[PDB]
């Protein structure tokens, strides 16, 4: 896994441009390869042996999940300590949802492509859990196709919204596939609304308390352009955010339904 990865000297890169932030992300130009890449440097000034090894586990987990809808990783840079990744021109879904009103055919495809990627992770032996899925992680290429990113919290802030209610109920609960299914439901909410969940609210703790009983983000209305598929996606979202995690569908089932929304 970590053998096909490379080590990058900072001399190999050029024209650094900040893009995200967590740790800052930079669009760099590999000079000898004549192509662009992304690199994520650590926030700290000193990088201890936990960081260096943690970054390596993130890279290994990315290479293991080589797939169409997963972000490719090339190696780890040493000069500044950071992860050398594929550059996605269109950037994050978060930025795209803020940017402008999106057509529904796209929205449904972004949802489906994300779902296919997540399904792939869960299909591994053993399953790879993402445990961090949010529109900031969901990255889009020049032609608006998804690649899932940020395996920093994977397993073999304003982010309370993506946290499952069972995680608030029980201190130190065992992580599962149904964690990702919940977060994915909140992503769907983001696509249907182009809003951030609980954006306007007074306080975190009140909403996090109400979530443990049943209070989820307010349902969007049925859209005019694609009212049949919208209603269907909304349905799926609701099943994906159920309080009882055994009621939530598997990504095998989810992909099966999101595919029909693209037909
Ligand atoms: N254009 C572009 N290209 C990228 N390759 C890119 N990569 C990331 C990223 C960050 C950490 C880990 C990781 O596996 C990917 C982010 C990123 C993800 C989450 C939060 C954040 O601040 C930045 N944004 C990006 N944007
Ligand atoms: Cl429709």
Count of separate DSSP helical elements: 8
For the sheet with most strands, the description reads: 6 strands, mixed
What is the CATH topology assignment?
Answer: Transferase(Phosphotransferase), domain 1
Strand content: 5-15%
- For the record, the CATH architecture stands as Orthogonal Bundle
How do the SSEs run, as a string of H and E?
A: EEEEHEEEHHEEHHHHH
| Molecular shape | globular
How many β-strand runs?
9
Our measurement of the CA-to-CA distance between the termini, rounded to an integer number of angstroms, reads 37 Å
Q: Strand order, biggest sheet? A: 1-5-6-4-3-2
Bound molecules: 3,3'-(2,4-diaminopteridine-6,7-diyl)diphenol, chloride ion
Protein name: Receptor-interacting serine/threonine-protein kinase 4
Keywords: ANK repeat, ATP-binding, Cytoplasm, Isopeptide bond, Kinase, Membrane, Nucleotide-binding, Phosphoprotein, Receptor, Repeat, Serine/threonine-protein kinase, Transferase, Ubl conjugation
Subcellular location: Cytoplasm; Membrane
Subunit structure: Interacts with PRKCB. Interacts with TRAF1, TRAF2, TRAF3 and TRAF5. Interacts with BIRC2/c-IAP1, BIRC3/c-IAP2 and XIAP/BIRC4.
């Amino acid at each position: 896994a970590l053998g096909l990865l490379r080590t990058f000297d900072a001399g190999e890169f050029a024209g650094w441009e900040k893009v995200g932030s967590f740790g800052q992300v930079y669009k760099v130009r590999h000079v000898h390869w004549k192509t662009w890449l992304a690199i994520k440097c650590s926030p700290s000034l000193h990088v201890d042996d936990r960081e260096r090894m943690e970054l390596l586990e993130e890279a290994k987990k990315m290479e293991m999940a080589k797939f169409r809808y997963i972000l490719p990783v090339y190696g780890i840079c040493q000069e500044p300590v950071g992860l050398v990744m594929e550059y996605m021109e269109t950037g994050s879904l978060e930025k795209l949802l803020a940017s402008e009103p999106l057509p529904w055919d796209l929205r449904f495809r972004i949802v489906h492509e994300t779902a296919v990627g997540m399904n792939f992770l869960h299909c591994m032996s053993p399953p790879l859990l993402h445990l961090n899925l949010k529109p900031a992680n969901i990255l889009l290429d020049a032609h608006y196709h998804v690649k899932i990113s940020d395996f920093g919290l994977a397993k073999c802030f304003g982010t309370i919204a993506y946290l499952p209610p069972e995680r608030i109920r029980e201190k130190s609960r065992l992580f599962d596939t149904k964690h990702d299914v919940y977060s994915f439901a909140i992503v769907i909410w983001g696509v249907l609304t182009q809003k951030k969940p609980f954006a306007d609210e007074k306080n975190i703790l009140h909403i996090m308390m109400k979530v443990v009983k049943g209070h989820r983000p307010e349902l969007p209305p049925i859209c005019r352009p694609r009212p049949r598929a919208c209603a269907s996606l909304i349905g799926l979202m609701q099943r994906c955010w159920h309080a009882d995690p055994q009621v939530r569908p598997t990504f095998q089932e989810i992909t099966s339904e999101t595919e029909d929304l693209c037909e």
